[PDB]
């Protein structure tokens, strides 16, 4: 009943576990709140300005490796930034459908432009630090949103691996391989790789 | 009027593309048609069975690299792939969400085993083989719903650069950076790499 910023999200937050993205109206959550819709518009306008809300929270709550710890070579920044946004996406249902579905925020410019000031210094052209913080990204949001949705011969002790674990072993190889590409990149430089 | 299965799906995918996945709702199908709701349901019995023809026929008219041409290298055929799959992905709106929230076909569980056949004569273990194979899906689903959905002082250098393109460059430079880092643990073997 408590009508705050922090509140208003707390419940949405809790609501899109039990719905979903697509189960998540403004109507639903009001009831969940214990108020008018009337009174939830004062404060939330359309679902649109709530899911920017909570894409933006919920990166700020838990994607704890946003940057650099200081005097770490770009590889491991790539690896730890990686890591700690799947489990971010991954800590609500549908995590990763919210994060896609929003622009960016001007907190977000900053670490981005942190980040790109981070990759140059360790020797990236701005075209290719940028294309290496965004295949990290891409990467790690097409794998976690195929975890998050869901017999040939070889096939069946393939989908076993798959099903061992939760997804994590496939993200985990395909990163060190997507980080190794870059290194073969950079230290080129003007020769013929 | 005609309405067999390819008239069905015609119609389908002409309306994906004026109102998207959200949009497409059955009651909307019928009306294009020109037909009743009931007359519909004989044919397409849901939401859910008419996103699953979809997504397996935008595959079949439009994935038309899914399998290797003789004597092509592996790393070629992971390229060609990876560049078909994003053209059939992108041919459609939401495409790549009508992608996502389907299972695979047996079609496909066909072609991921002649495909992870190939991997394996080529000197990938079973698990690295499909740990390729995946990433690159990934990476590529990824990179194509950012496409799809959509001022610090780097950042407007690189910005310039994303907006200069489609999205390709960044896609075909991640991409290549993927399967080099392949390469690197395919040669390997069982040293320290």
Redesign the interface.
Known sequence: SRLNRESVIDAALELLNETGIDGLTTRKLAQKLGIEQPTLYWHVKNKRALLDALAVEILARHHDYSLPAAGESWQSFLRNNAMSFRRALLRYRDGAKVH??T?PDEKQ??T??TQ??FM?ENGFS???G???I??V???????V??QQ???????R??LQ??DSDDGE???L??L???????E??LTALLQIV
Chains 1, 2 share one sequence.
């Open positions: 896609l579905g622009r410019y900053d981005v432009e790109l000031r140059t701005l075209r290719d940028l294309y290496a965004s295949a990204s891409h990467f790690t949001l097409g794998a949103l195929e949705e869901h017999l040939p011969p070889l096939l002790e393939a691996i798959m072993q496939a993200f190889h395909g060190e391989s997507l980080i190794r590409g870059f073969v990149q």
